[PDB]
Amino acid sequence: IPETLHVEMSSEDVIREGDTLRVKFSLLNDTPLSKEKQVVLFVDGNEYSVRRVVIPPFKKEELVFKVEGLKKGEHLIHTNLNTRKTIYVR
Amino acid sequence: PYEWENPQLVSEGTEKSHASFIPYLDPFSGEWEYPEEFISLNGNWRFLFAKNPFEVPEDFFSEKFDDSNWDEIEVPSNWEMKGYGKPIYTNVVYPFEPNPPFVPKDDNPTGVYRRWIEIPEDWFKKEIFLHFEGVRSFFYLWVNGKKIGFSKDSCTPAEFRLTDVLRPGKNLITVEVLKWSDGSYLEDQDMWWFAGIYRDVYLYALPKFHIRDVFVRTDLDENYRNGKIFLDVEMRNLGEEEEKDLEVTLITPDGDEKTLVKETVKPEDRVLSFAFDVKDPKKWSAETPHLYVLKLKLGEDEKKVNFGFRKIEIKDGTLLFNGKPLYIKGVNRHEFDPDRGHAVTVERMIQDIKLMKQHNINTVRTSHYPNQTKWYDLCDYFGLYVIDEANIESHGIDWDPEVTLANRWEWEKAHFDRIKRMVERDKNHPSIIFWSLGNEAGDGVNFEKAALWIKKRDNTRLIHYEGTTRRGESYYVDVFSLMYPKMDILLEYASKKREKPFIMCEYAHAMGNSVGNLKDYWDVIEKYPYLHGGCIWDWVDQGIRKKDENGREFWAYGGDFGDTPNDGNFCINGVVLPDRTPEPELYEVKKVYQNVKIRQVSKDTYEVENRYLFTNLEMFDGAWKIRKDGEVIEEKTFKIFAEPGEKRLLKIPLPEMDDSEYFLEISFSLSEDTPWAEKGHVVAWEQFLLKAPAFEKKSISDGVSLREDGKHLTVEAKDTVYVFSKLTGLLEQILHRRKKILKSPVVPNFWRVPTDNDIGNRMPQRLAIWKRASKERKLFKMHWKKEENRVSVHSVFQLPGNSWVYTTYTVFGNGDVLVDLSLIPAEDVPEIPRIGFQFTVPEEFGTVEWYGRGPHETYWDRKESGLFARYRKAVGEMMHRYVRPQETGNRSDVRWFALSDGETKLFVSGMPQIDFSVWPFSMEDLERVQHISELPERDFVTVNVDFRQMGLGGDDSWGAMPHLEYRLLPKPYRFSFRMRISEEIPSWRVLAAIPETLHVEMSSEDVIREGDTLRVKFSLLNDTPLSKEKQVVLFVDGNEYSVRRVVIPPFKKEELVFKVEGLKKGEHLIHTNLNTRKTIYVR
Amino acid sequence: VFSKLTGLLEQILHRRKKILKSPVVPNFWRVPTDNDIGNRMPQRLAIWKRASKERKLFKMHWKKEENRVSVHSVFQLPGNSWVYTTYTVFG
Amino acid sequence: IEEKTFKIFAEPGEKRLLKIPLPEMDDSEYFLEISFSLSEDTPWAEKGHVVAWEQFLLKAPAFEKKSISDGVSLREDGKHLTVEAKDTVY
Ligand SMILES: [Mg+2]
């Protein structure tokens, strides 16, 4: 059987120092088995947060991560599910 | 003082600027038209070349002088392209010693042209003019022995009234051209320094009372429905007495005629002004270039002007064209030809425009001087937007307010003349939407005053100058413009209210293998307010066609003509090669610039968005195609009705699907022929995954043999023998039916041949340790392990920089080999250029097949243009010939590839994907040679099989890096692929089965005190033949507490410690995602 | 009489007689006093003297009703300040 | 002062633009009304029944302030103040 989830990551392109970044993730299961997944968020190469998800067949789950404490400059946000983005802190 | 060293003398003896009337392009036939009283002076002239103006023979300009021993040169031309002197390339530095306004007297290449011409008798009841379309950089004119005057700006015309000094029958024309003048201080563009009469020369005759000039402007009402024409007609009298009849006729795009004016006018110098109303005129755009014609006749004087109804305006910081938001999808173009230099023909101009429109370009910037008049006529007829730029650049002079020529009172009239001569020549073309004042020439009063003159003369176009907006807001421009800005600059401009739109006059520097992250700029431009697009730097590589010693052609650049000082290959910045052959990066531009957007709602439902301003999608033929493991199984045509801005739904009925991979492609093509392209040309496409494949894992039962000696381990399976070295730790040979497949061993590889962007950011110095780690290594340990159905060979290396690399080869009884790599970088090493393996096979492997992105090369930050399908090529056509050889030939997101020698196939499949490339030479050969001609002949093929390579970048080519998301930062990485040598291509979807589970143990303290820290230890043992990447998650009372990423090479144990803080009195559950659980007691 | 190239009110004709010898212009300058010279006002405030003589017409439009017409001009000035002029003529 | 009929083509969910040419206006207050009615009889209602309408201010009025020159008289007694103007007594 096919064994892969369909993923999309999204957030704000630019925030102000002191503000919070909201990172949204959609996971779609179009396979015939339920999937258990650890979704890990990395900030500048370092592990920042993790969520356990169970996704039944023919279902979409939505997650939000809140990222605090980002100082002025540009930052890489990435996951263990092959999604990557640059974010700019004004 | 010499007139060619005096900035305050701009010309002498020349007529006043006016609008172009000769030649005239007929928009109904597309044919060029000339006046009745016209004599071309193109052809052969007697020519004399001198090293400076003082080495010219005396009395060269007299009728009596003998020139019968002079050489003959063809006009128009640059004389550096005919054999005389040498071409010089400099970026910013002047090719003489900078000391304005002084030019050298010793070395100043000089040319003298002589020609005899026959004026008919009936011309002398009229007024006679001599017209020079362009001369670089300065010239003196003599007619029948007498001095008439001189001229100084290389890119705008010079006209002289000669009715007095000319006689019936045979007359002499003599011209002396100087290469360098005071004018040269404002012509410091990053380009080749040439010289000569490089554009057309002619004689024509007008009546004594004639139309000198015409200014036609249009307005549109608040509904962009009805129009007005505003016409200024300037008349000039040179000794006429009788009254003449003036007629003005309007011809519509359909072909209908109407008389606007018919009156009698007494002969005098006057400007007549008229205003007319027109109902529902056809509007001009780049999508729909409808042209009206004004026919003007005063006595026997006849002229014609093409014009269009169109309006450019700024409303609340937004750029509007005929009432719609306009996005500039542009390129910078130099007027350059590899055989003729600046003397470009109409045939080449037409080739440039059709290629631009076939790649979704809508705008051209004339970088950085006015082009020939026929360029603007063709942009009116075919439909491109134009940014027309004045010939002013003084980069080599410092931009400090006291130093810059933009603030010096003696350079004031030179700046004004160059701007005014452009505007007066080009003011009637509907294609021109912006006037640009110049490029990289500092800021000051000399620009401020010329910019206020333009706005009071012409209120129908916007003014642009990046030299003022780079210092902040400026009151005398309408557009905010920057060169090569980073993404944070665009997001900052869009974050507050603005009165002016933001345009990038240069971005995405295309020097060498480049144009990375193009889609990331356009995702920001289309989402945020006040951002209206930009022009890519640039269209065509300025390479000169030359022959080497053996007589094989190459493209020449700085320092290939003994020219010193030079700036090397910094003139090679194109998206097409000098002969107009596309570079692979032009396919990315076409994809990003397309005017249809397609979104997936569900697997069978697609939303289509029309982003054309004035075109209905009903003009295009729709098609969709479904591919099964890369081959077409279903095709269907459709038509969709969508107006500008509309979103429409498209429903596609899907078939029942098996265990293959399925991709959908949706495209739009031309329904019928256009002036710029043929029926079936694709204007837009998008692709979507319908279904991922189901991978098969097969149990192998057949056996494998193993023989050891003092230097070699030998592994036999079916009819393949694998030979491993105990001294190098490498796979050294593969024998298939007693035939050698390898010409060199399989080695780990971390290097790519530096691009022009890599050189500009010092990648070869910064990342030099990874080049060493690709050639030298120390074998620390080597062992093997046999089972019933397979053998594994494990090698451990330490590298320069102190990083570790683990290789594992597992040979199965069916002849498959699994190849695994883990890289563990040391704590103080920099980012990695590439991660993969490199080997060589014999040149008999001459054909390649693949399932992946194609058909052209793609990279991590430049791959949207790569369509997923099955492709086939010869090895020699799997690389691009960049003018300076560089990294080339990568194929991305590949499921499988196969090399064939006719009988035997070398097959590689990804787990689940790889990148690859194949070259007919070594990495060392590619890094050494600096010209295409020097690439040597070899009896082997180099094969690269990669996890990934870092992006190309190209925000600029003098410091910018690839974006953070396209770099390999130093952390642990793993990678594997399958290889088979056989007579047929096996199924990429079928692999050998292996065990896939780690052995884990968790341990900690049973009891702690409140305030103390719990230490949880984890051991992970990998006894499988593949490296494992794992997220280890620790839970405390059901809630996620901490996570660690681990890479565990084969036959290795890793140990982790987690510290748990803040546990209060009582009992607590500690557990992981790896099936370990414990109760802990807090005393 | 309004100019579409300068954006200024250029002439007023009353019973065919000219009232203006030069156009109506926005003005930000005064001729420096002895106190102004002593505190360097002519150097410090020199941008407002330039803004009184030079300007760039950015936009110009008009709107007619039954009993009046309005003529609106938008200028940018030296120093990058904005000035809006509006003339409303009644019946 | 002005009425006009029109027809607009819009499918369920679609937004369509409607352009209304305005007259020259004096110092009065001007309101626009846009309505939709039944083209022909239904089982539940007759032709011309309104199903939807909306109204919008086009132009606010110009208020006039007039200088009064005429006089007012005043008589006091023990219980009443009496004010006379034209032919009204307060
Ligand atoms: Mg290039």
PDB file of C-alpha atoms in Angstrom, chain B residues 31-243:
ATOM      1  CA  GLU B  31       7.240  46.958 -44.462  1.00  0.00           C
ATOM      2  CA  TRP B  32       9.805  49.820 -44.021  1.00  0.00           C
ATOM      3  CA  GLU B  33       9.156  52.999 -46.149  1.00  0.00           C
ATOM      4  CA  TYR B  34      11.536  55.864 -47.187  1.00  0.00           C
ATOM      5  CA  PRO B  35      10.907  59.350 -48.690  1.00  0.00           C
ATOM      6  CA  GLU B  36      10.997  59.928 -52.529  1.00  0.00           C
ATOM      7  CA  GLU B  37      13.985  62.383 -52.248  1.00  0.00           C
ATOM      8  CA  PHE B  38      16.357  59.982 -50.340  1.00  0.00           C
ATOM      9  CA  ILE B  39      20.044  58.917 -50.956  1.00  0.00           C
ATOM     10  CA  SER B  40      21.592  56.128 -48.759  1.00  0.00           C
ATOM     11  CA  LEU B  41      25.313  56.668 -47.882  1.00  0.00           C
ATOM     12  CA  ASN B  42      25.610  53.038 -46.553  1.00  0.00           C
ATOM     13  CA  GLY B  43      28.289  50.933 -48.381  1.00  0.00           C
ATOM     14  CA  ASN B  44      32.063  51.391 -49.053  1.00  0.00           C
ATOM     15  CA  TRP B  45      34.022  54.521 -47.929  1.00  0.00           C
ATOM     16  CA  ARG B  46      37.817  55.094 -48.264  1.00  0.00           C
ATOM     17  CA  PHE B  47      39.269  54.676 -44.710  1.00  0.00           C
ATOM     18  CA  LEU B  48      42.557  55.588 -42.895  1.00  0.00           C
ATOM     19  CA  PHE B  49      43.425  54.343 -39.324  1.00  0.00           C
ATOM     20  CA  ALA B  50      45.850  56.350 -37.071  1.00  0.00           C
ATOM     21  CA  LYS B  51      47.087  55.746 -33.450  1.00  0.00           C
ATOM     22  CA  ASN B  52      46.100  59.348 -32.411  1.00  0.00           C
ATOM     23  CA  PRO B  53      44.726  62.542 -34.078  1.00  0.00           C
ATOM     24  CA  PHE B  54      48.278  64.047 -34.612  1.00  0.00           C
ATOM     25  CA  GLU B  55      49.524  61.059 -36.777  1.00  0.00           C
ATOM     26  CA  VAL B  56      46.913  61.928 -39.520  1.00  0.00           C
ATOM     27  CA  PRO B  57      48.292  63.187 -42.904  1.00  0.00           C
ATOM     28  CA  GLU B  58      47.886  67.019 -43.294  1.00  0.00           C
ATOM     29  CA  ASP B  59      45.145  68.393 -45.674  1.00  0.00           C
ATOM     30  CA  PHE B  60      43.241  64.987 -45.563  1.00  0.00           C
ATOM     31  CA  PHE B  61      39.864  66.899 -45.899  1.00  0.00           C
ATOM     32  CA  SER B  62      40.642  68.785 -49.219  1.00  0.00           C
ATOM     33  CA  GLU B  63      39.238  67.784 -52.684  1.00  0.00           C
ATOM     34  CA  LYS B  64      42.789  67.812 -54.252  1.00  0.00           C
ATOM     35  CA  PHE B  65      44.132  65.234 -51.645  1.00  0.00           C
ATOM     36  CA  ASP B  66      44.884  61.722 -53.110  1.00  0.00           C
ATOM     37  CA  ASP B  67      43.299  58.744 -51.197  1.00  0.00           C
ATOM     38  CA  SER B  68      43.650  56.095 -54.021  1.00  0.00           C
ATOM     39  CA  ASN B  69      46.037  53.998 -51.766  1.00  0.00           C
ATOM     40  CA  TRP B  70      43.578  54.064 -48.737  1.00  0.00           C
ATOM     41  CA  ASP B  71      41.806  50.833 -47.539  1.00  0.00           C
ATOM     42  CA  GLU B  72      37.973  50.500 -48.076  1.00  0.00           C
ATOM     43  CA  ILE B  73      35.638  50.008 -44.992  1.00  0.00           C
ATOM     44  CA  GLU B  74      31.871  49.136 -45.081  1.00  0.00           C
ATOM     45  CA  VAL B  75      29.446  51.573 -43.283  1.00  0.00           C
ATOM     46  CA  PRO B  76      27.873  50.961 -40.858  1.00  0.00           C
ATOM     47  CA  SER B  77      30.439  49.126 -38.624  1.00  0.00           C
ATOM     48  CA  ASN B  78      32.699  49.218 -35.533  1.00  0.00           C
ATOM     49  CA  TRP B  79      36.336  49.154 -36.850  1.00  0.00           C
ATOM     50  CA  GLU B  80      37.547  46.870 -33.957  1.00  0.00           C
ATOM     51  CA  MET B  81      35.286  44.183 -35.631  1.00  0.00           C
ATOM     52  CA  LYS B  82      36.935  44.904 -39.102  1.00  0.00           C
ATOM     53  CA  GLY B  83      40.624  44.417 -37.989  1.00  0.00           C
ATOM     54  CA  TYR B  84      41.799  47.901 -36.768  1.00  0.00           C
ATOM     55  CA  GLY B  85      42.861  48.443 -33.105  1.00  0.00           C
ATOM     56  CA  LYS B  86      41.640  46.079 -30.310  1.00  0.00           C
ATOM     57  CA  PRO B  87      38.377  45.826 -28.302  1.00  0.00           C
ATOM     58  CA  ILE B  88      38.776  46.754 -24.561  1.00  0.00           C
ATOM     59  CA  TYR B  89      36.443  45.513 -21.749  1.00  0.00           C
ATOM     60  CA  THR B  90      36.435  47.384 -18.372  1.00  0.00           C
ATOM     61  CA  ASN B  91      33.613  47.291 -15.740  1.00  0.00           C
ATOM     62  CA  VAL B  92      34.011  50.583 -13.726  1.00  0.00           C
ATOM     63  CA  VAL B  93      37.674  51.744 -14.372  1.00  0.00           C
ATOM     64  CA  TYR B  94      38.273  54.031 -17.427  1.00  0.00           C
ATOM     65  CA  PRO B  95      40.656  52.519 -20.058  1.00  0.00           C
ATOM     66  CA  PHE B  96      42.818  55.741 -19.776  1.00  0.00           C
ATOM     67  CA  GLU B  97      43.982  57.715 -16.643  1.00  0.00           C
ATOM     68  CA  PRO B  98      40.935  59.405 -14.972  1.00  0.00           C
ATOM     69  CA  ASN B  99      41.374  63.248 -14.925  1.00  0.00           C
ATOM     70  CA  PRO B 100      38.245  64.972 -16.345  1.00  0.00           C
ATOM     71  CA  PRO B 101      37.925  66.457 -18.876  1.00  0.00           C
ATOM     72  CA  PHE B 102      41.355  65.318 -20.290  1.00  0.00           C
ATOM     73  CA  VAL B 103      41.896  62.332 -22.693  1.00  0.00           C
ATOM     74  CA  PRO B 104      45.296  60.934 -23.853  1.00  0.00           C
ATOM     75  CA  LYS B 105      47.124  62.499 -26.887  1.00  0.00           C
ATOM     76  CA  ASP B 106      49.552  59.499 -27.363  1.00  0.00           C
ATOM     77  CA  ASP B 107      46.987  56.576 -27.537  1.00  0.00           C
ATOM     78  CA  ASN B 108      43.588  57.777 -28.934  1.00  0.00           C
ATOM     79  CA  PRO B 109      42.496  55.583 -31.886  1.00  0.00           C
ATOM     80  CA  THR B 110      41.391  57.783 -34.847  1.00  0.00           C
ATOM     81  CA  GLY B 111      39.554  57.033 -38.130  1.00  0.00           C
ATOM     82  CA  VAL B 112      39.145  59.202 -41.294  1.00  0.00           C
ATOM     83  CA  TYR B 113      36.348  58.297 -43.815  1.00  0.00           C
ATOM     84  CA  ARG B 114      36.095  59.846 -47.380  1.00  0.00           C
ATOM     85  CA  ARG B 115      33.313  59.408 -50.022  1.00  0.00           C
ATOM     86  CA  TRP B 116      32.113  61.172 -53.264  1.00  0.00           C
ATOM     87  CA  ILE B 117      28.283  61.538 -53.844  1.00  0.00           C
ATOM     88  CA  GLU B 118      26.112  62.712 -56.841  1.00  0.00           C
ATOM     89  CA  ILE B 119      23.320  65.268 -55.931  1.00  0.00           C
ATOM     90  CA  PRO B 120      20.642  65.655 -58.693  1.00  0.00           C
ATOM     91  CA  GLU B 121      19.892  69.218 -60.023  1.00  0.00           C
ATOM     92  CA  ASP B 122      16.144  69.301 -59.012  1.00  0.00           C
ATOM     93  CA  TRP B 123      17.170  68.983 -55.263  1.00  0.00           C
ATOM     94  CA  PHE B 124      18.418  72.664 -55.222  1.00  0.00           C
ATOM     95  CA  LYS B 125      14.841  74.149 -55.328  1.00  0.00           C
ATOM     96  CA  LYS B 126      14.493  72.475 -51.822  1.00  0.00           C
ATOM     97  CA  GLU B 127      16.401  72.229 -48.460  1.00  0.00           C
ATOM     98  CA  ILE B 128      19.034  69.386 -48.133  1.00  0.00           C
ATOM     99  CA  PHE B 129      20.043  67.616 -44.825  1.00  0.00           C
ATOM    100  CA  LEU B 130      22.815  65.057 -43.962  1.00  0.00           C
ATOM    101  CA  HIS B 131      21.678  62.623 -41.130  1.00  0.00           C
ATOM    102  CA  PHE B 132      24.056  60.491 -38.916  1.00  0.00           C
ATOM    103  CA  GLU B 133      21.984  57.963 -36.830  1.00  0.00           C
ATOM    104  CA  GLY B 134      25.027  57.325 -34.503  1.00  0.00           C
ATOM    105  CA  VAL B 135      28.884  57.762 -34.228  1.00  0.00           C
ATOM    106  CA  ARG B 136      31.147  56.785 -31.258  1.00  0.00           C
ATOM    107  CA  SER B 137      32.475  58.869 -29.551  1.00  0.00           C
ATOM    108  CA  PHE B 138      33.227  62.258 -31.334  1.00  0.00           C
ATOM    109  CA  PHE B 139      33.505  63.454 -34.988  1.00  0.00           C
ATOM    110  CA  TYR B 140      34.348  66.491 -37.241  1.00  0.00           C
ATOM    111  CA  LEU B 141      32.503  66.957 -40.614  1.00  0.00           C
ATOM    112  CA  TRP B 142      33.964  68.561 -43.835  1.00  0.00           C
ATOM    113  CA  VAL B 143      31.861  69.082 -47.053  1.00  0.00           C
ATOM    114  CA  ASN B 144      33.700  70.048 -50.345  1.00  0.00           C
ATOM    115  CA  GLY B 145      36.810  71.085 -48.293  1.00  0.00           C
ATOM    116  CA  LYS B 146      34.867  73.346 -45.800  1.00  0.00           C
ATOM    117  CA  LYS B 147      34.319  72.690 -42.005  1.00  0.00           C
ATOM    118  CA  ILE B 148      30.544  72.459 -41.054  1.00  0.00           C
ATOM    119  CA  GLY B 149      30.925  71.438 -37.344  1.00  0.00           C
ATOM    120  CA  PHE B 150      31.069  68.519 -34.813  1.00  0.00           C
ATOM    121  CA  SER B 151      28.937  66.311 -32.397  1.00  0.00           C
ATOM    122  CA  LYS B 152      29.516  64.382 -29.084  1.00  0.00           C
ATOM    123  CA  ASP B 153      26.698  61.893 -27.884  1.00  0.00           C
ATOM    124  CA  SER B 154      27.268  58.365 -29.336  1.00  0.00           C
ATOM    125  CA  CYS B 155      23.642  57.036 -29.244  1.00  0.00           C
ATOM    126  CA  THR B 156      21.429  59.951 -30.598  1.00  0.00           C
ATOM    127  CA  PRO B 157      21.431  61.413 -34.150  1.00  0.00           C
ATOM    128  CA  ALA B 158      23.291  64.441 -35.688  1.00  0.00           C
ATOM    129  CA  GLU B 159      21.676  66.351 -38.623  1.00  0.00           C
ATOM    130  CA  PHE B 160      23.297  69.214 -40.693  1.00  0.00           C
ATOM    131  CA  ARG B 161      21.617  71.609 -43.221  1.00  0.00           C
ATOM    132  CA  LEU B 162      23.957  71.630 -46.317  1.00  0.00           C
ATOM    133  CA  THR B 163      21.842  73.469 -49.024  1.00  0.00           C
ATOM    134  CA  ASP B 164      24.454  76.348 -49.332  1.00  0.00           C
ATOM    135  CA  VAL B 165      27.862  74.473 -49.296  1.00  0.00           C
ATOM    136  CA  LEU B 166      26.671  71.680 -51.738  1.00  0.00           C
ATOM    137  CA  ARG B 167      26.614  71.907 -55.613  1.00  0.00           C
ATOM    138  CA  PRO B 168      24.916  69.896 -58.436  1.00  0.00           C
ATOM    139  CA  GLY B 169      26.862  66.798 -59.653  1.00  0.00           C
ATOM    140  CA  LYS B 170      29.788  65.338 -57.612  1.00  0.00           C
ATOM    141  CA  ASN B 171      30.468  66.421 -53.946  1.00  0.00           C
ATOM    142  CA  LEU B 172      32.979  65.206 -51.263  1.00  0.00           C
ATOM    143  CA  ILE B 173      32.004  64.199 -47.640  1.00  0.00           C
ATOM    144  CA  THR B 174      34.889  63.743 -45.089  1.00  0.00           C
ATOM    145  CA  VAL B 175      34.467  62.625 -41.397  1.00  0.00           C
ATOM    146  CA  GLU B 176      37.210  62.321 -38.685  1.00  0.00           C
ATOM    147  CA  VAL B 177      36.113  60.027 -35.737  1.00  0.00           C
ATOM    148  CA  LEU B 178      37.919  59.974 -32.299  1.00  0.00           C
ATOM    149  CA  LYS B 179      37.433  56.947 -29.911  1.00  0.00           C
ATOM    150  CA  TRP B 180      37.907  58.922 -26.625  1.00  0.00           C
ATOM    151  CA  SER B 181      36.653  62.491 -25.805  1.00  0.00           C
ATOM    152  CA  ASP B 182      35.296  64.396 -22.737  1.00  0.00           C
ATOM    153  CA  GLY B 183      31.969  62.682 -23.760  1.00  0.00           C
ATOM    154  CA  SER B 184      33.627  59.312 -22.742  1.00  0.00           C
ATOM    155  CA  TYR B 185      33.408  60.349 -19.002  1.00  0.00           C
ATOM    156  CA  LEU B 186      29.524  59.911 -19.284  1.00  0.00           C
ATOM    157  CA  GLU B 187      29.791  56.605 -21.332  1.00  0.00           C
ATOM    158  CA  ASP B 188      31.402  54.343 -18.641  1.00  0.00           C
ATOM    159  CA  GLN B 189      28.819  51.473 -19.029  1.00  0.00           C
ATOM    160  CA  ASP B 190      29.907  47.894 -18.029  1.00  0.00           C
ATOM    161  CA  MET B 191      30.491  46.895 -21.713  1.00  0.00           C
ATOM    162  CA  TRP B 192      33.067  46.689 -24.597  1.00  0.00           C
ATOM    163  CA  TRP B 193      34.699  50.048 -25.677  1.00  0.00           C
ATOM    164  CA  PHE B 194      34.224  50.214 -29.543  1.00  0.00           C
ATOM    165  CA  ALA B 195      34.378  53.147 -32.107  1.00  0.00           C
ATOM    166  CA  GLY B 196      33.273  54.218 -35.649  1.00  0.00           C
ATOM    167  CA  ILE B 197      30.208  55.118 -37.816  1.00  0.00           C
ATOM    168  CA  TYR B 198      28.133  52.135 -36.444  1.00  0.00           C
ATOM    169  CA  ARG B 199      24.576  53.241 -37.588  1.00  0.00           C
ATOM    170  CA  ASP B 200      23.146  54.368 -41.005  1.00  0.00           C
ATOM    171  CA  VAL B 201      23.996  57.652 -42.887  1.00  0.00           C
ATOM    172  CA  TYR B 202      21.693  59.296 -45.523  1.00  0.00           C
ATOM    173  CA  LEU B 203      20.754  62.527 -47.428  1.00  0.00           C
ATOM    174  CA  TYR B 204      17.111  63.718 -47.866  1.00  0.00           C
ATOM    175  CA  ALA B 205      15.390  66.920 -49.169  1.00  0.00           C
ATOM    176  CA  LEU B 206      12.310  68.864 -47.850  1.00  0.00           C
ATOM    177  CA  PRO B 207      10.358  71.811 -49.363  1.00  0.00           C
ATOM    178  CA  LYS B 208      11.363  75.400 -48.317  1.00  0.00           C
ATOM    179  CA  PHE B 209       8.174  75.486 -46.103  1.00  0.00           C
ATOM    180  CA  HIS B 210       7.922  72.125 -44.193  1.00  0.00           C
ATOM    181  CA  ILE B 211       6.723  70.390 -40.952  1.00  0.00           C
ATOM    182  CA  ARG B 212       9.826  70.315 -38.642  1.00  0.00           C
ATOM    183  CA  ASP B 213       8.204  68.358 -35.682  1.00  0.00           C
ATOM    184  CA  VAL B 214       4.979  66.538 -34.491  1.00  0.00           C
ATOM    185  CA  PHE B 215       3.888  65.707 -30.863  1.00  0.00           C
ATOM    186  CA  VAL B 216       0.787  63.385 -30.682  1.00  0.00           C
ATOM    187  CA  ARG B 217      -0.591  62.606 -27.137  1.00  0.00           C
ATOM    188  CA  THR B 218      -3.847  60.792 -26.090  1.00  0.00           C
ATOM    189  CA  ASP B 219      -6.165  60.994 -23.030  1.00  0.00           C
ATOM    190  CA  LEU B 220      -8.938  58.503 -21.965  1.00  0.00           C
ATOM    191  CA  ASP B 221     -12.077  59.306 -19.826  1.00  0.00           C
ATOM    192  CA  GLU B 222     -12.671  57.985 -16.216  1.00  0.00           C
ATOM    193  CA  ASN B 223     -14.293  54.759 -17.663  1.00  0.00           C
ATOM    194  CA  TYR B 224     -11.288  54.214 -20.083  1.00  0.00           C
ATOM    195  CA  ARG B 225     -14.001  54.276 -22.852  1.00  0.00           C
ATOM    196  CA  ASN B 226     -13.827  57.493 -25.016  1.00  0.00           C
ATOM    197  CA  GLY B 227     -10.558  59.186 -26.090  1.00  0.00           C
ATOM    198  CA  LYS B 228      -9.081  62.626 -26.955  1.00  0.00           C
ATOM    199  CA  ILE B 229      -6.169  63.390 -29.352  1.00  0.00           C
ATOM    200  CA  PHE B 230      -3.895  66.404 -28.546  1.00  0.00           C
ATOM    201  CA  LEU B 231      -1.763  67.323 -31.635  1.00  0.00           C
ATOM    202  CA  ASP B 232       1.105  69.937 -31.781  1.00  0.00           C
ATOM    203  CA  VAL B 233       2.442  70.653 -35.364  1.00  0.00           C
ATOM    204  CA  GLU B 234       5.641  72.828 -35.651  1.00  0.00           C
ATOM    205  CA  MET B 235       6.176  74.488 -39.112  1.00  0.00           C
ATOM    206  CA  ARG B 236       9.441  76.070 -40.432  1.00  0.00           C
ATOM    207  CA  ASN B 237       9.864  78.575 -43.352  1.00  0.00           C
ATOM    208  CA  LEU B 238      13.198  78.939 -45.283  1.00  0.00           C
ATOM    209  CA  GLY B 239      12.341  81.555 -47.990  1.00  0.00           C
ATOM    210  CA  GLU B 240       8.815  80.489 -49.194  1.00  0.00           C
ATOM    211  CA  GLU B 241       6.259  83.322 -49.944  1.00  0.00           C
ATOM    212  CA  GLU B 242       3.092  81.579 -51.393  1.00  0.00           C
ATOM    213  CA  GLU B 243       0.406  79.969 -49.087  1.00  0.00           C
TER     214      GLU B 243
END
